[PDB]
């Protein structure tokens, strides 16, 4: 089978950029999508910098075979420092989730002094860069938090109920309402409905997924597409129970 269009591929290192891959495949933008998760190896934040960047070049030499036209990085800590060595050894576009989501706030507030909300993993976070951007482009009133906890919450299926309440009432002691709320990591767009019903709607939610669709358009030539696009999953340890999930997350 071959036709003449579009075939990119997803790669997180392990199941949260699916929220990626959902907002992607609601777009239509492709005709075949290929998720890779380094499954083995999670989490990415533990490590140091090089070693995140020997990790993220074994994936690029996985996507040889299939020939992509464009990869998306869907890990922030992949994001943040590897995002650089791939394109040294990359032949087309390859992309992260960090820019988009800051232009998606900015153009979201074009207001340089409005409050910006940041959660992420705590490596996320101490790598500064979602803070070493916005601030070069003069936004002021942001605060970034380590919400870690909600990583498992996720994988352990828990998005409602007091217990999650009492994980939000916990982190969110004394925090001013923010204007915007960012999702600096892939599990969190599981949690969204309890936020936002938390947070109320003066705060608005920025998607990882959403911005990078929205991404796309801005940088690339892309055509919608009338049939529904192809998936394909891939992981280095335990490949099923990751087709289960995004089954999950997706409803296909």
Partial sequence: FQSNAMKIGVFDSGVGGLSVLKSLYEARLFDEIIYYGDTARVPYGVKDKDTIIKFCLEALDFFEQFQIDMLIIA????????????????????????????????????????????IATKATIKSE??????????????????????????????????????????????????????????????????????????????????????????????????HKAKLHFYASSDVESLKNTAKIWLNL
């Fill in 75 to 118: 890990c922030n800590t992949a994001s943040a420092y590897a995002l650089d060595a791939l394109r040294a050894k990359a032949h087309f576009p390859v992309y992260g989730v960090i820019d988009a989501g800051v232009e998606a706030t900015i153009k979201a507030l074009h207001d340089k002094n409005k409050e910006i909300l940041v």
């Fill in 129 to 226: 860069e979602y803070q070493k951007r916005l601030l070069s482009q003069g936004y002021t009133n942001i605060n970034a938090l380590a919400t870690g906890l909600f990583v498992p919450m996720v994988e352990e299926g828990i998005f409602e109920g007091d217990f999650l309440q009492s994980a939000m009432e916990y982190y969110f002691k004394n925090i001013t309402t923010p204007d915007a709320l960012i999702l600096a990591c892939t599990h969190f767009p599981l949690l969204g409905r309890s936020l936002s019903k938390y947070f109320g709607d003066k705060t608005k939610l920025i998607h990882s997924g959403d911005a990078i669709v929205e991404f796309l358009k801005e940088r690339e030539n892309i055509d919608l597409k009338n």
